[PDB]
Structure 1
Amino acid sequence: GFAFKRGISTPDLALITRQLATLVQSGMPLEECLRAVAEQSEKPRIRTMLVAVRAKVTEGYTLSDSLGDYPHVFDELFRSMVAAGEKSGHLDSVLERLADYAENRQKMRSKLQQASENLYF
């Protein structure tokens, strides 16, 4: 019947996107980068997802295709950016952009959430 899953927190996405961008830009293979981000995670759910994303990458699927198994986590814009890097041979640069993006999203969202709580109480 019906299913419903939620995404991850804005700081959680900011962390894994920064970590992945750091690793890929350093020249490490994508599969190894995904393993490092998973094994460095404090969050079981994020660990499990990245193992699953990695598993598809090792079966030959693109990163963008693989992230599409978690559309509740990585929205269409995020996955399009990934696809454009992969298509063009600029996966490193796009991940850097997405990491800056995810960090700016976390800051603005957290500021707004905090402002709501401060004022309400």
Structure 2
Amino acid sequence: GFAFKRGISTPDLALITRQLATLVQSGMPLEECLRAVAEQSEKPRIRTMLVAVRAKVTEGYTLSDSLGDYPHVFDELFRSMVAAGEKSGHLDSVLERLADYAENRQKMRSKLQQASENLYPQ
């Protein structure tokens, strides 16, 4: 009974984290923010995931706890940061920090991937 799951692409994580941060900072309810990010996704799997995260949130779970249903997508640091914002009343600010982080991660990582590819078939 071995299982294996992969997360999402670094740009896909950057997009959904930016969108969530944007919506939460505009003052819309968290559950409605999760709905909009899901409904705006081009990726069926991400829609399904965020529907599922939202479903746990509506059943009373914190965002951090709900994201822990997808540990292969949101790592311990990401979830820890969310948990910190929620425990402290600064989810809005932590999501902004997570969105900036994920964006810079995507950019840096994409560069390396591209440079690797560039040099290889040179």
TM bin (shorter chain): over 0.9
CA displacement 1:13-32 (0-9 Å, x = unmatched)? 00000000000000000000
CA displacement 1:58-99 (0-9 Å, x = unmatched)? 000000000000000000000000000000000000000000
Identity %: 100
Return the TM-score normalized by structure 1: 0.99
Return the TM-score normalized by structure 2: 0.98
Consecutive aligned runs of 4 or more in structure 1 exceeding 3 Å deviation? none
Gaps of 5+ in 1: none
- Equivalent residue pairs, number: 120
CA RMSD of aligned residues (A): 0.2
CA distance in 2, matches of 1:6, 1:118: 26
**Structure-1 residue corresponding to 2:75:** 75
CA distance in 1, matches of 2:28, 2:61: 18
